[PDB]
Design a protein around this ligand. Structure first.
Ligand SMILES: [Mg+2]
Ligand SMILES: [Mg+2]
Lengths: 174, 174
């Protein structure tokens, strides 16, 4: 698994691989790990059970409505319920989300994190994509979509658990 | 991870590294491991899950309000709940805290400890910073902020799990 997010020049994106491993065997290659939320104003991705993320994403929209779409406050309420509830505590996933305001991470420990320069990379391949995106962002003018695309192909070549099927959700705020 | 506390000449401080390791890989370098509490009257640090410490720090403020800000009595009530509750028993972290009165440590076993000369050092690098702070305190006139800063840079050079990003919260009571 690998997922990436990048923000540049008024554009922010999220991208993720389609591989679903089972043991040493590939279960499914076309999984959609990236999607839009809250009237498409938000883009997000997940590493974990497809239902485990679908549940957390729905409650996150309810946290946004209570906070009128604020990204940070809705996330802390989601991470707060995640470690707290005995039902949600069984859930095991890594959530990534960004909007025009900022990108940040969420975890089943209840930790929330905004990466330096809003650069998110998660999944088993995420350290590899982070090293690739870090290089292009400093040494090239490429748009945030161009960097997240190339960084994910590299993590898929390296991580055995990541493949080259891609899904992306870009957001332009300029 | 490394965290340090020092008290001298009416000044007490807490300092900690930003490294967040995952396996053999660095996850985040800028983590804020030190913060203030109870109307900024108290400074504290933590080694463990960022949510696991944020939960314990909140309840400790509630223990302070019940005890009117007493540091020692509020800590024993926190360490008492920590080992006791089945929910808190799952939490795994090392807490450090000090005010103008004294510095002391807290643990998930429920142990509370005041170091000799209120010198706290914890984390994977904490034994290294303790040996450095012990030398400067006896052989130099340096202020408590100067010793905690230099002791943490040494532990970061030594401990692979500690880095040189720093956060400090000083308290002056003179
Ligand atoms: Mg592969
Ligand atoms: Mg180091």
């Amino acid at each position: 698994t690998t997922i990436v997010s990048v923000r540049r020049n008024g554009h922010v994106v999220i991208a993720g691989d389609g591989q679903a491993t089972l043991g040493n065997t590939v279960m499914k290659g076309n999984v959609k790990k990236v999607r839009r939320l809250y009237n498409d104003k938000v883009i997000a991705g997940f590493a974990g059970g497809t239902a485990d993320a679908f549940t957390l994403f729905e409650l996150f929209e309810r946290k946004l409505e209570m906070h009128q779409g604020h990204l940070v406050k809705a996330a802390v309420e989601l991470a707060k319920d995640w470690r707290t509830d005995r039902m949600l505590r069984k859930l095991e996933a890594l959530l990534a989300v960004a909007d025009e305001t900022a990108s940040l991470i969420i975890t089943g420990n209840g930790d929330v994190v905004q990466p330096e320069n809003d650069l998110i990379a998660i999944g088993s391949g995420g350290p590899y994509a982070q090293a690739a995106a870090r290089a292009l962002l400093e040494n090239t003018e490429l748009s945030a979509r161009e960097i997240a695309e190339k960084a994910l192909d590299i993590a898929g070549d390296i991580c055995i658990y990541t493949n080259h099927f891609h899904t992306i959700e870009e957001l332009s705020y300029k």
